[PDB]
Design a protein around this ligand. Structure first.
Ligand SMILES: *[C@@H]1O[C@H](CO)[C@@H](O[C@@H]2O[C@H](CO)[C@@H](O)[C@H](O)[C@H]2NC(C)=O)[C@H](O)[C@H]1NC(C)=O
Ligand SMILES: [Ca+2]
Ligand SMILES: [Ca+2]
Length: 274
């Protein structure tokens, strides 16, 4: 296993957002041309094993552990009725105090806040990616496609990401092989070498959230200078076309930086190799 390995994301210009927004309220539009300097991106979401190395080294107590609760999806035992604040849910206990990560060491770490993610990435000699870096990386060298791999959800009849199949939120058929999370190295990589950049766990980025974007061309944009929520990208194992079509690279959502949930993790980026 090399679950902290990074890949080189090449310098380029790309179209961020879309002029065919699917969730207009989220500021998916307008499409805008963005230039990104070469940098490195983690191939994988940060796993439980990798986060444990951080905690072993630093003693870091996550925000969920200090608050004493975190959000858990009802189906696997609030923003929606299916999100419950569960006492004692945290990265080591993803569904509550009598769940464990011992059988899922290579799954993405969950119940990590934006602050927890920044602590980890900086400890590792890295940083969070910006939303633009994240989206560029997600798109994997393709232009104006829905998904990292193109426009078909199941190219060649194959599952390419861990999302929901069935009737959400009542029945997840596990058709794609995973009801909850999958190992961080599951499913094919995209054109840049990245795994589970859509689906599996949501991923924090460094940007403050806004829905107001200009069509002006930008270089290495960092998002707005202020805000209340940070941007998360990529969707999770919970997403479905019928409710929550958020497993597209252009999709975007937010949470307060001290938030945590059982479908939200992260990966790191770096200017140079650590
Ligand atoms: C985090 O630290 C724990 C505690 O030291 C590690 O677990 C121990 O590892 C030693 C050395 O391999 C084993 O002999 C013990 O059986 C383990 N003890 C316990 C309490 O589990 C753990 O391996 C470290 N985690 C990572 C990812 O490096
Ligand atoms: Ca699934
Ligand atoms: Ca993901």
């Amino acid at each position: 296993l090399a679950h902290s390995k990074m890949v080189p994301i090449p310098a380029g210009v790309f179209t961020m957002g879309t002029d065919d927004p699917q969730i207009k309220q989220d500021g998916e539009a307008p499409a805008r041309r963005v230039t990104i300097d070469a940098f490195y991106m983690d191939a994988y979401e940060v796993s439980n094993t990798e986060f444990e190395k951080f905690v072993n080294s630093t003693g870091y107590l996550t925000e969920a552990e200090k608050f004493g609760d975190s959000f858990v999806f009802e189906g696997m035992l609030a923003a929606a009725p299916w999100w419950l604040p569960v006492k004692g849910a945290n990265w080591r206990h993803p569904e509550g105090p009598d769940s464990t990560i011992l059988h899922r060491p290579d799954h993405p770490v969950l119940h990590v806040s934006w602050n927890d993610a920044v602590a980890y990435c900086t400890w590792a000699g890295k940083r969070l990616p910006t939303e633009a870096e994240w989206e560029y990386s997600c798109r994997g060298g393709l232009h104006n496609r829905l998904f990292p791999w193109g426009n078909k959800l199941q190219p060649k009849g194959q599952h390419y990401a861990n999302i929901w199949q069935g009737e959400f939120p009542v029945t997840n058929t596990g058709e794609d092989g995973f009801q909850g999370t999958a190992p961080v190295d599951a499913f094919p990589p995209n054109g840049y070498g990245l795994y589970n950049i859509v689906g599996n766990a949501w991923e924090w980025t460094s940007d403050w959230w806004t829905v107001h974007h200009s069509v002006e061309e930008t270089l290495n944009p960092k998002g707005p200078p202020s805000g209340k929520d940070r941007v998360k990208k990529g969707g999770s194992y919970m997403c479905h076309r019928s409710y929550c079509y958020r497993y597209r690279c252009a999709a975007r959502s937010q949470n307060t930086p001290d938030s945590s949930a059982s479908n939200l993790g992260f990966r790191c980026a770096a200017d140079r190799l650590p």
